[PDB]
């Protein structure tokens, strides 16, 4: 379909822009005492989690746009 092909290009192009890796900060006995590390560990943890979700969602979207996987209730809402 027209929108099915249109969403495929956008999802694939979007996957190119977004990065792929983001490693969590490492806990250390003296790192905890640093407030800067205390704040930054939350930043990467939120970033790495959200990065994994969005990319996986787009991945599923491209899979639907190629017909490899069936549409689900959440996937229908996300694609809509």
């Amino acid at each position: 379909p027209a929108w099915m092909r249109t969403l495929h290009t956008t999802a694939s192009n979007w996957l190119h822009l977004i990065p792929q890796t983001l490693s969590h900060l490492k806990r250390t006995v003296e790192n905890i005492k640093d407030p800067l590390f205390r704040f930054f560990e939350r930043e990467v943890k939120m970033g790495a989690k959200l990065l994994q979700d969005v990319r996986q969602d787009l991945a599923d979207v491209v899979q639907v746009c190629e017909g490899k996987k069936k549409q689900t209730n959440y996937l229908r809402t996300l694609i809509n």
Binding site: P35, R38, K45, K70
Partner: protein, 1622 residues
Amino acid sequence: MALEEFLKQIREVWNTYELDLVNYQNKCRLIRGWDDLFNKVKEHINSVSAMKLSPYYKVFEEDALSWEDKLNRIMALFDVWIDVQRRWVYLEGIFTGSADIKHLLPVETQRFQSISTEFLALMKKVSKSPLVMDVLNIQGVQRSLERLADLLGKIQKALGEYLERERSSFPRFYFVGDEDLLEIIGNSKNVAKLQKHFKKMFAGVSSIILNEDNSVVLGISSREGEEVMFKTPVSITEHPKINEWLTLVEKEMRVTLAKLLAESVTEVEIFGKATSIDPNTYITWIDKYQAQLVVLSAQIAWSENVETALSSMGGGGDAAPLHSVLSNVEVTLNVLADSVLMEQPPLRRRKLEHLITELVHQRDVTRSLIKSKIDNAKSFEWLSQMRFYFDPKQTDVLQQLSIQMANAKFNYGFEYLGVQDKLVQTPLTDRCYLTMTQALEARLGGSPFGPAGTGKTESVKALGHQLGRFVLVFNCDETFDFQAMGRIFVGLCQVGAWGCFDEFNRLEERMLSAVSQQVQCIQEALREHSNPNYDKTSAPITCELLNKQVKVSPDMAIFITMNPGYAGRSNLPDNLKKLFRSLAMTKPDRQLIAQVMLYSQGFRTAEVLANKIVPFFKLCDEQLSSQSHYDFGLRALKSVLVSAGNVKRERIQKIKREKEERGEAVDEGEIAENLPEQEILIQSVCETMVPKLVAEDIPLLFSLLSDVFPGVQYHRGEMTALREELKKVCQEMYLTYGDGEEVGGMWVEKVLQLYQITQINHGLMMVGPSGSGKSMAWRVLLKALERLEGVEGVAHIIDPKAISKDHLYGTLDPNTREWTDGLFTHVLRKIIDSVRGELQKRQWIVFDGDVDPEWVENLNSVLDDNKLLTLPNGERLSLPPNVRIMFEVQDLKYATLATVSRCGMVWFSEDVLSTDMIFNNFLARLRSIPLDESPMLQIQRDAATIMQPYFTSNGLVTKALEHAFQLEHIMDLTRLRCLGSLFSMLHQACRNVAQYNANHPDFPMQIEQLERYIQRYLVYAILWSLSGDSRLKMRAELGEYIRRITTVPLPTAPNIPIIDYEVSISGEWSPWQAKVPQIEVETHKVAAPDVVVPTLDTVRHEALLYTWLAEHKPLVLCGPPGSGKTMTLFSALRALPDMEVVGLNFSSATTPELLLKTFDHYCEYRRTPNGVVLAPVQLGKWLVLFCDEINLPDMDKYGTQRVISFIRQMVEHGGFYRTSDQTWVKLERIQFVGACNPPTDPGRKPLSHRFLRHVPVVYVDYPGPASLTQIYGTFNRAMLRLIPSLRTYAEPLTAAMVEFYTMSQERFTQDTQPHYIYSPREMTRWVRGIFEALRPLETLPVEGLIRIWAHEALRLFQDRLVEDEERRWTDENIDTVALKHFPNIDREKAMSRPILYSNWLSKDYIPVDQEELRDYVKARLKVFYEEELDVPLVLFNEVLDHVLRIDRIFRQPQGHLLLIGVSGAGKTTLSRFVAWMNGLSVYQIKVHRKYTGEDFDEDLRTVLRRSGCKNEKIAFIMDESNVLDSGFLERMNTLLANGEVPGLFEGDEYATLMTQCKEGAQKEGLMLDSHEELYKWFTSQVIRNLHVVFTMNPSSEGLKDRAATSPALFNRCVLNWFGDWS
């Protein structure tokens, strides 16, 4: 032998026990001493059970059993008598003390005299013989008491008009419910029962003080014991009327406070204008006067001193006596601080803290005045402050004190407030005071707005308490309508009280506009009250409220509180907002609050502590992980500061005790100096904030504690006494206990954290994932506290979302304005009344369920410091100190900040409940609890030993479980669902061994045999419990991984997966294929609904369901529609004869009512000593509730399905509550089976994890092509036995049928159209259609067989198509499939495009020519016009096809039609024509503008009666326009699927229907007498005599909506897409 003596002791007690009778006004001898009577019965009942435990119970069993019957009767009789006697007491005082009621209400005054005369008769009989057993032996005494109770309720309910009039006499009665008001009026003579009601009518008066005659009121008392002695005592003898002397008491209360204030002002003038103050003199003054008076007098003295000083500086160049005012405040504050440092009586301590709070504010104000160089008393920097002026020369004592702020002047109301917790006067508080007082001067309301926990509600009360006003807090919701809010205004206006309405935007917008008229009308009365022209000697100011003239007191005020940032809240109309003055309170001055609170509590380093504790809360908010259950606001800071004072007091008491027991040297100064205030604050912080923290945040907070508070460590106390109690309780409850790092130490720590939170907060939340040990924690704690403190613990568990909000809190009748209690309201009110000693017990109300703002925001004032349950009828219920409100939840993603802030939080994690402890609990129960109710227990013990090596840390089960979470399941996988599935199956294995031993009494199973069976069974159980909700590939995956890890012998097949093997009782593996044979079905049973062709998947699922169903464990069948879920359960239920199954068809609109309607039909409610028990009417039968669309019910905006919560409550707790009497009902012999499609399907929602924990799920996928060949090749082989010439074509015919079904299923999917569902149901209909045509046919050439095969396929796969392209595909693909599997046949003869079949031109169903069919229909249509409907119709080819399709379904049992097409296409007319042709009677409902659901039920009853009792074939034609509500489709859905509506016939309608069914069955010649067989015959008749034709337009979104609203419309109805004319 000691059993006999205990029986003799109990016999002697009851033969000597007599009812303690005391005279009541020389009218009767009322029963006294209920508590001793009830306790003795309870003690003997528990003893009666103990003797049964011993094996010697048998010799005295009959006598013991006869005894327990008598005590139960005693308990039953006296559980009503106490209610009857109490009801009669206050009803007697109303019909006798008052004279106006006899003229006003004469009819039931005589009714009361009749029942009363019966009561005195009964009482005199009890008097003659006061023996308890003799009273029990009175004939019909139980029935008589219940009749007395029922009648007294009717008279009591019929006193509403009298109560409304009495409220006008004494205005404060408007804040007392009807139940308590009757008690107050009736018990006017005996004042001792009035003491518990004064708290509801006064701000700080909890009890009154009387002389020893109880005839003169000497004064009042508060809940803290503070007393005010009246200067003029009120004598009740002179004013016998209750409303008369209550007014005098209220009037005297104000006067005596004003006169005491004048005395205190004169006394405090000495402390003012004094350079040095003696602490002993100041302390004596403080103790002499009440708490609110000492603060007021200090306020007056400071105000006059500043006014005097500013007058001296009025010349400008004069000196500065303002410094003398500052020094006097500082000198007084130093004495105040010194007094707090030393120990003080609790009442004097609270007075000192209030005085400290006031003088800190005075010092700050005076310093500001000096810093501003103020020299004039008329400067606004002094006038903007709140100043207190006293005029002793004024004759009116109530007018001697004036409160002024800016231009606003107020008179002290002199309402006694007791000892209220004062607020720190922050700059935001001053801005609030300035703005609210300006609103009061403008005769306008106040609207402090902002986020939660900013001090808005307390600010209104604090200002009202400062003016001596009675402030009433109302927690408003959507039920606060025009009438309820208007009645609240009437009470406030007449009393002269402040009404603070918090969450006032929770009202409906239409209601908000409506109340603006009343607020505006009230303010105009207030505005005209303030004009000097008005004189109080004239007519008092009245306003128009609820069509009544209501007096308005000048002390009345209205304040509203809202959070305008909450999404989903009503927007106030502008004409309402202009009636109020709004102020933003967003950033409370926490630092000043913390500093003043710690300074008043006795901390020397308060300033350092405050500067450390306020940033720490900010640090925790921004450095800890963001969790929805985290709150670090002012309310959290308020709790820790209060607990810090409590801890410091406890520590000081501890050090003094240590000094006392170690020598004799005690000094307050030494202890205060050498006291670790840093550790006290840290301990308070951790005790409140640690339990809510997640595991990752615990080091995070303890690290932050090191930077802000270096050097101080938290060492939690070792609660040795409580831990021992916990260990004993856990041992008896089969729960694992550990200390610290042992298995279960984290869970024990969570329980201890829960205990600590109970002591600080009255509101608690256990938050954690499903199966985290939350419920087991508080159950064990409740028992342990019972065994330790000796206080009996009672737990009331409520599922708030399993019922409606009306049923949870109560409903106000819009017509009669009568209040009925809800579930939570009834429990709370019963505890408050404490008729059966509920206040001496620990009452816990656990809200186990989902939390959303709609229902829990009603508890805001309950969980605040107000501790009030406000109801829309003006009633306020106080939370007793022994009651805890608990919320056991799995998430808080929908709760708001208001709810989270008000509750203490304990966070539970899946880590807290280690898999090891679950294994230990299962094994401990197996070794202890026999499975019969022991040889079985012995088998269980040997079995438990065998599985012990596998139920270990990182054991086979653990490793398998870990690997299982990495696979994909049709439902979300949780640990406890899988393990509960595993444990139930292992119970079956033990029951299996018992069966073998019973079947082999000579040779029972050996240990080696048991070991082999258990080992193989365990692997078999692990696979099906951990991969039953997965497809075939992951079942293979789990089997492969288990083969990699296990040491148990496994089948040695090179490629067959382990899931294809069962475990024989022989202890050896046996393939499932040995139980699935190639059976040959009879000719007359071909593709019958109850005929199942065994396959590999069928036998595996059947044996699985038998294992789960037997254990009575609820289960869920998941899979695509038509996969065989319903077929498998009924086939598995066959092996369960004692189990009776009832089918319920869930829809989007399904509520727990459908569950309740089924219960009212198939079950009965039986009252027992234990309680109300709901059990099936059939005896020795287990009712199986089969719900077909469990995941279909609608989810609200907060992710909850009400019926799913209802079922979850019914399974987890074993019962539910009856909204009729808030009575707990316990289920018996009732099991539950669920069926559903995968949650990813449209319209389906994922089931809650808490529900799924109790229900194992097995995935039933579509049979494979190999399975389809076997299931339908057998049917064809039997079907084709009718004509032997076609028997050789059985194999190719099945192949063609299998192939076309696969292509149709692959080509058309739900993506294209919502109704494009293809399943083996179509393949079953395919075989039925061919068989039905072939039955009469004596012989048929192969060409005719293909024509029938092609025809049925066109009817099953093409009739539902929407686009012509799809239909063309079906036609062509059918041509190709038939030629692919049937070569060398006459293509044209067997596949002529007009494939038409009919039984109209002959007796048999044979192919019909188009032109002959057209002529015959023309002739029939001619008769149709002259007989039924004279509407000429033009006949075209599509019409001929349609009338043949309609004729096909009308000839089928339970055949229903869904005709989809454009309006006016002929659907209704054609259906009427075919129905007339087949003899069916057309029924259509006549919808008008007033047609409601009750009309539809009556219309339905007409169809059911005619088609079920009269054996009349009826075609029920219904159009989508006939549907006016979702109620229409809910009954239609049930009727289409089951053929009967559960709640359609009730009362006399059911009685009449059974009579007609008996008459109808007699006509048929059948002998049915009982009701259940009459209904079953009635159901069978309707299923065979009713044809429902649904007609709707081809809407795109409407079709998708209907696929969930009415699932039966797409599963039980044949869909025919007429569409538009081509």
